[PDB]
Amino acid sequence: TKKLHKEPATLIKAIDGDTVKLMYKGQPMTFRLLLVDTPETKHPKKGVEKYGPEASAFTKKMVENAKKIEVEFDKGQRTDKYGRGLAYIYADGKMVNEALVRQGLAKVAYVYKPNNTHEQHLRKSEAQAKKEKLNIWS
């Protein structure tokens, strides 16, 4: 207990896989999907990795289509580095981070601390997605 709780956050705009511009409690704020490693569609280098667009097409719809978006704090720091709040985005009770990590659209990633609350979860879905030969693992 005294663990966590989510707070509603209203959408504004989906940027890229791990990047969601969401109107958070007051002023507009960018947020980064916590713990996933989803490919890009922007980068002056690399370019548009395979599953790049797709991975994003997932995120944009999960959130754009949700009825109630709650965001979740990680025991590290809301301030990321680019500002971009770090959080656990949910869409109608579902974890947007896991969904992508389960449909093979971002591998588990950037392990740090004390953020890890959902570590052995994204881990189990990914394995499953790994057992399967889904999208990113094919």
């Epitope: 667009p53 797709e54 991975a55 994003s56 097409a57 997932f58 944009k60 719809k61 289509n65 009825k67 949910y90 109608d92 009770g93 579902k94 974890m95 389960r102 449909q103 659209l105 052995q120 979860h121 189990k124 879905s125 499953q128």
Partner: antibody
Framework: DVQLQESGPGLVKPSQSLSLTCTVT?????????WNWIRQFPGNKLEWMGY???????SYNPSLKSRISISRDTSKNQFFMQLNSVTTEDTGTFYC??????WGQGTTLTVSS | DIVLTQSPSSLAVSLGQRATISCRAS??????????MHWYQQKPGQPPRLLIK???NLESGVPARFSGSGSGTDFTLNIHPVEEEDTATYYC?????????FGGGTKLEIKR
């Protein structure tokens, strides 16, 4: 691997609660076997009831929300569902389903004289 | 709240011939990984079983005769080399938004 055992049949008078269930082999429930309750009136009518996830909160279909619920006895590997104030308009089978595969063999409930 | 309509309500096909089951969506359900419609099969006395995962995309274990197609709102399940065990009622489901609405049902009869 993966199995969905549910409570047996149940005649019930119109208005006196009961709880279906889904013990779940091939797992334990934590990382999720996200339930997704379904109803099926005698004849042919799959109606989505609602769901419940790893987080704990649930999400009941707009249509018929309150007086119907979904619980979580994980150690005793189960999620439950209650239909308070049962009505004749409630007779049918109820299937729990995992949020990525398998369905349960369903529970039949009836409600008459 | 999208209402799905699949027809005809009854499908009787000569054993070994094609069978196309249609499922129409009120609103459109597609995107860039979506075609958010899946297909279920239900034998009598039994619970539905998953057949296809995202319009196309056969599930695991399901034979290769089943094939879903469809863009926008017209989605169809194809089971061409149709067989004896293909007697069942096949439903469509959408997960573009909750409530997840199921299909009205399409009964498949095999003639001989």
């Amino acid at each position: 691997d993966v199995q969905l055992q549910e409570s047996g049949p149940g005649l019930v008078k119109p208005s006196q609660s009961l709880s279906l269930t889904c013990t779940v082999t091939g797992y334990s429930i934590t990382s999720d076997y996200a339930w997704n309750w379904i109803r099926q009136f005698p004849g042919n009518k799959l109606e989505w009831m609602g769901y419940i996830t790893y987080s704990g909160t649930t999400s009941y279909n707009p249509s018929l929300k309150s007086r119907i619920s979904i619980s979580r006895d994980t150690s005793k590997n189960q999620f439950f569902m209650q239909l308070n104030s049962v009505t004749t308009e409630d007779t049918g089978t109820f299937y729990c389903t995992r949020g990525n595969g398998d369905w349960g063999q369903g529970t039949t409930l009836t409600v008459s004289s | 709240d999208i209402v799905l309509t699949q027809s005809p309500s009854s499908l009787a096909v000569s054993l070994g011939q094609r069978a196309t089951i249609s499922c129409r969506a009120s609103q459109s359900v597609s995107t860039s990984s979506f075609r958010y419609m899946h297909w279920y099969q239900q034998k009598p006395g039994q619970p539905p079983r998953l057949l296809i995962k995202y319009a196309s995309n056969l599930e695991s274990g399901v034979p290769a005769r089943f094939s879903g197609s469809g863009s926008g709102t017209d989605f169809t399940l194809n089971i061409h080399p149709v067989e004896e065990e293909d007697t069942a009622t096949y439903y469509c489901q959408h997960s573009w938004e909750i409530p997840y609405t199921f299909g009205g049902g399409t009964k498949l009869e095999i003639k001989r």
